[PDB]
Design a protein around this ligand. Structure first.
Ligand code: ADP
Ligand code: XB2
Ligand code: MG
Ligand code: MG
Ligand code: MG
Lengths: 188, 479, 148, 144, 100, 146
């Protein structure tokens, strides 16, 4: 038993019945739905990798949306705050063809308000806690998170996240997804 | 001083310090949320290698269930959106699968697993649900969170099995309600919800955003009844309608323990999760039911290989009657299969046994066939390596000729005169003539084929597009 | 300028002179020096000439050797405006603030309000540069006209 | 003669008949002087023009011309087949492989010649930014 | 813009002047003056006429074929996108019925 | 110098057939009596001594085979413009009429290109007498250049 067995089963029923399939990852928060999704996507990515631009893009489409989507909560250090549905499209020859990300609602309220023991969205602190001064000064923001009232309330340092690298990761996720530098800078 | 319209002229209203703070919050939220949805729309604008599509596999992670000590509008949205996905599990495994058995006329008795929560999704989704209230209430400029709380309690208390009054044992009884989403309690704080649902933006300020020098901020606000509740709802209803056109496999991820202690596994939390995910019922129905069915035409043709004397080629064979003879010939336990109108039915023991017998019978025949295919693949590829070796050989020979010629003093005649001479005048002419005529023939036939087929397909789809467009017009009229 | 600069300046006059060797265009020569060097206001050309008559502008043709110093003198008027100086100009005509200028009032401004311009040039300079709504991306128009 | 394509034989006949500038039926030093001055450039003043007669002193006919070129033609083959062979050799069929792949394979698979001649041609251009062996240019530089 | 257009256009006019100057240069009497102007020569006039006629046909069709191939691709791309839109619209009519 | 024109342009080695295969002796050279078949190649004219003056002016007679071929390479230089000329005409007038007046361009090029004298303007007027249409046909001109 493994999640990779379910992904292979869905690819087999696809090729045999000639019908669309789905893999419906579910549970409580903190169980692994985002990582299992990243693994199912890794399944199709590496399967098409032995037999790539879309292959990589579908994997990175999770963490780039996570860094904006997601905030450390009391229930998980990396709990996402938006619903996502992916379609992975395959051609007749069974190779990877296209993908389609539909997202249902971002927790927009979090951007200005956090309870004790929970962060604002990770993009905020990882731009503040920064290895790159240029991001810190182009925003002309202070390196200390605490003075900005809306993000600073709640809790802003976490036991398990290297925000310097999570910033590096989100930067790389937009690099591979091909967001232009002007778009990436404008959204920061 | 936001500008509001009164007739054709705009009037100016002075804002309070608290309400300008709230408006700056709303501007921060709506710029963030639009920036996120635009980032998704740009992801969906890449992720497209423009290749023709025939099958998709939809992978869903639509929320973690969550309890915090403080839950708000999106903690309702996230818990609800998962709630629908688990009710989809209930419907697919226990309704959709079990109804098919009775429809096919199998001697099967429908068993009620009792796993249903459709009352609580209807509690949210229905035009009388919580999200329906928050959308009907947020239109009124004179609405307030406290009356929203009154009407919200009045409509559901004593009318929904999942809606109950809160206890507020930990205090804070200012304005609370609790909703028992599938995986347990979640308590909610009603404060601020209406402003969050409407998200009213100061129209002068967004009009200035539209007017911004920053191309993104204009693109975000270009083209700024349709509340956040309603838009989310319609996306999630699209989700289920898009998903019912797929064959689903479910994955139940279980949290073991609160404290992140790895390798530790708290039995009460995991077992309660298996209880709420209804997994033991999925075991019961997979063991008792029939996990796999194949169309008579597809399987008779696929596994006739098990006994070609039962299904001889050329001779007429009925798929149902042939399937009856073949399966009787396998000598398997006759209680492990059933006959449907258009699908054959197998237990999991028989399915697995037929699967393996098909794999072995195919292995004995097709491995011989594959041995021949490996024969032809290796032979042809290594012949290509022999041809590429031969080309390498004539390359190194001509390179040796090339050195022999340029070091040769006579090369002055050889190099310059032959481009001038008749061979470059005529052999190149013949080469271009045959190249052009061959490309002419192939390009002409391929383009005519494609156009003739594709124009009639396009017009057929465009007519269907206009018919459904008229249907949409009828919808927009009724709405 | 380099001695090889004046030769290629010379052959502009040599193509524009329709005479075999006694013409240079008193009415059109200053207009060409814009291309070979920097560009003045025509009034400054008239001030270096010393305010001649309009009939002189239509009938007179001047002598080239006296004009070689005029090349440098017309080049001499520094404090020409920069990119930001120009881009803040058309914003006063922009009554929207978004970065577009409607061509119905842009051509009006360029024709009616500043120095005189040959109107066909005003027609053809913006031709092809318009958008479907009937406006101009003037920060592009300025970075167009400063560069090429 | 079976080794030659009749095209090259007729081309050799065309060259031999055009090279006999004085209708001599034979080649001499003065014919070489006019050929180099008309075809080439005034830089041909070097003594090397006298060394060219040393290679084949005395009159030579088309038969010996053909036999001398034929023995000199060892390792040469008709251009049309070499074009086809190069198009088959390329995996992509269009001249875009990198030099390091081809030089490694040619030296490994057969006939370990000196590496330096193939290396000097293929590294005459940087293989990381200009490694594309546009074989038409290679075959023509060898010949045309 | 005026300056550069005038120079390039007059340079082309200088090429046109070279064309006519060349003809007067050619109004000298060589053997070729008789044979080139009138058409009796087989390989030069006839085979070049074959080159020009065949190339004319090939290149005209080359255009037609490349633009046609593109147009067929464009329709394919339109049918692929319409196929997605038709399926999403089929789902959307069910969604709209739910709106009703 | 003069030999380089033969090397720059192409479609000229084919003209050597207009020597090689129209020769009456098929031996390799223009003899002093090839005029006998030039009169037949034209058809409407006959023997004249001026053809001998042609044979003496254009060539030294049978001495060197290449001098005939290079004489044709000397004439070759004209072939370069047709690549440019089509564009030059489209940029001159893109609408299609191309009604470039004869006496208009007759006075244009004198002002535009070099200083044309009486023998050059004699050659320019002889190049195309003003037709009643009053415009130089760009197509007729290109076919003339052809
Ligand atoms: N199977 C697993 N292997 C490794 N880490 C896991 C696994 N499941 C969950 N985690 C960890 O638990 C946290 C939550 O995982 P995630 O996939 O984000 O689930 P959720 O989205 O429900 O929070 C992360 O820190 C992740 O590394
Ligand atoms: C109706 C549903 C539960 N189902 C089946 O009951 C059987 C399916 N497929 C058969 C044909 C199969 C068996 C083994 C490998 C591939 C496909 N698909 C299915 O989707
Ligand atoms: Mg998650
Ligand atoms: Mg000799
Ligand atoms: Mg003769």
């Amino acid at each position: 038993p493994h999640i990779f067995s379910i992904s292979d089963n869905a690819y087999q029923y696809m090729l045999t019945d000639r019908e669309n399939q789905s893999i419906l990852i579910t549970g409580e928060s903190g169980a692994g739905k985002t990582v299992n999704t990243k693994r199912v996507i890794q399944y199709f990515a590496v399967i098409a990798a032995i037999g790539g631009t879309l292959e990589d893009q579908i994997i990175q489409a999770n963490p780039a949306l996570e860094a904006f989507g997601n905030a450390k909560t009391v229930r998980n250090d990396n709990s996402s705050r938006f619903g996502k549905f992916i379609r992975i499209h395959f051609g007749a020859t069974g190779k990877l063809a296209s993908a389609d990300i539909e997202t249902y609602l971002l927790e927009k309220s979090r951007v200005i308000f956090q309870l004790k023991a929970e962060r604002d969205y990770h993009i905020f602190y990882q731009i503040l806690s920064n290895k790159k001064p240029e991001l810190l000064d182009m925003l002309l923001i202070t390196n200390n998170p605490y003075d900005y009232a809306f993000i600073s309330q709640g809790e802003t340092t976490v036991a398990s996240i290297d925000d310097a690298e999570e910033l590096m990761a989100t930067d790389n996720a937009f690099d591979v997804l091909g967001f232009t530098s002007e778009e990436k800078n404008s959204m920061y | 001083h936001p500008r509001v319209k009164v007739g054709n002229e705009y009037v100016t209203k002075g804002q309070n310090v608290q309400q300008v703070i709230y408006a700056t919050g709303a501007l921060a939220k709506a710029v963030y949320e639009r920036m996120f949805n635009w980032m998704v729309t740009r992801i969906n604008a890449t992720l497209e290698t423009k290749q023709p599509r025939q099958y998709f596999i939809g992978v869903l992670d639509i929320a973690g269930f969550e309890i915090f000590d403080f839950n708000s509008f999106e903690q309702l949205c996230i818990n609800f959106t998962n709630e629908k996905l688990q009710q989809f599990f209930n419907h697919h495994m226990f309704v959709l699968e079990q109804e098919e058995y009775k429809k096919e006329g199998i001697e099967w008795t429908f068993i009620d697993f009792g796993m249903d929560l459709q009352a609580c999704i209807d509690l949210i989704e229905k035009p009388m649900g919580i999200m329906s209230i928050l959308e009907e209430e947020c239109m009124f400029p004179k609405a307030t969170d406290m009356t929203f709380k009154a009407k919200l309690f009045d409509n559901h208390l004593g009318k929904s099995a999942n809606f109950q009054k809160p206890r507020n044992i930990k205090g804070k009884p200012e304005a609370h309600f609790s909703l028992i989403h599938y995986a347990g309690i979640v308590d909610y704080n009603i404060i601020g919800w209406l402003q969050k649902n409407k998200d009213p933006l100061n129209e002068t300020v967004v009009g200035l955003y539209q007017k911004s020098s920053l191309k993104l901020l204009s693109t975000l606000f270009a083209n700024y009844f349709q509340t956040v509740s309603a838009l989310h709802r319609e996306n999630l209803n699209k989700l289920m309608t898009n998903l019912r056109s797929t064959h689903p496999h479910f994955v139940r991820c279980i949290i073991p323990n609160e404290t992140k202690s790895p390798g530790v596994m708290d039995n009460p939390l995991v077992m309660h999760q298996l209880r709420c995910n209804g997994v033991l019922e999925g075991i019961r129905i997979c063991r008792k039911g029939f996990p796999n069915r194949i169309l008579y035409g597809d399987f008779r043709q696929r596994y006739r290989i098990l006994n070609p004397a039962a299904i001889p080629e050329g001779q007429f064979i009925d798929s149902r009657k042939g399937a009856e003879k073949l399966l009787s010939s396998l000598d398997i336990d006759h209680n492990q299969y059933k006959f449907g109108h258009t699908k054959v039915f197998f237990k999991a023991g028989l399915l697995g046994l037929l699967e393996e017998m098909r794999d072995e019978r195919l292995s004995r025949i097709i491995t011989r066939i594959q041995a021949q295919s490996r024969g032809v693949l290796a032979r042809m590829e290594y012949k290509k390596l022999l041809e590429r070796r031969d080309s390498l050989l004539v390359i190194q020979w001509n390179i040796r000729a090339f050195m022999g010629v340029k070091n040769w003093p006579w090369m002055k005649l050889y190099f310059k005169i032959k481009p001038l001479l008749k061979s470059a005048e005529r052999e190149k002419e013949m080469a271009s003539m045959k190249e052009e005529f061959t490309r002419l023939k192939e390009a002409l036939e391929k383009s005519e084929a494609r156009r003739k087929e594709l124009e009639e397909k396009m017009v057929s789809l465009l007519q269907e597009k206009n018919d459904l467009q008229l249907q949409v017009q009828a919808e927009q009229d009724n709405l | 300028f380099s001695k090889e600069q004046q030769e290629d300046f010379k052959e502009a006059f040599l193509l524009f002179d329709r005479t075999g060797e006694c013409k240079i265009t008193l009415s059109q020569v200053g207009d060409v020096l814009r291309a070979l060097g920097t560009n003045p206001t025509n009034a400054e050309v008239k001030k270096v000439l010393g305010n001649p008559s309009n009939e002189e502008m239509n009938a007179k043709k001047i002598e080239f050797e006296q004009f070689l110093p005029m090349m440098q003198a017309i080049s001499n008027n520094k404090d020409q405006g920069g990119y930001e100086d120009f881009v803040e100009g058309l914003r006063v005509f922009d009554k929207e603030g978004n970065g577009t200028v409607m061509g119905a009032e842009l051509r009006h401004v360029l024709a009616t309000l500043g120095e005189k311009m040959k109107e066909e040039e005003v027609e053809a300079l913006l031709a092809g540069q318009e958008d479907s709504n009937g406006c101009i991306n003037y920060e592009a128009f300025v970075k167009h006209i400063m560069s090429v | 003669f079976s080794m030659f394509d009749q095209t090259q034989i007729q081309e050799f006949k065309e060259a031999f008949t055009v090279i006999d500038q004085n209708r001599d039926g034979i080649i001499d030093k003065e014919d070489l002087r006019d050929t180099f001055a008309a075809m080439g450039r005034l830089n041909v003043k070097n003594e090397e023009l006298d060394a060219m007669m040393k290679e084949a002193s005395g009159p030579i006919n088309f038969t010996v011309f053909l036999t001398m070129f034929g023995e000199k033609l060892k390792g040469a083959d008709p251009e049309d087949v070499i074009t086809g062979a190069f198009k088959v050799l390329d995996p992509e069929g269009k001249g875009t492989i990198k030099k390091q792949f081809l030089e490694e394979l040619l030296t490994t698979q057969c006939d370990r010649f000196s590496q330096e001649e193939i290396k000097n041609m293929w590294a005459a251009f940087p293989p990381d930014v200009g490694g594309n062996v546009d074989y038409k240019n290679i075959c023509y530089v060898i010949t045309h």
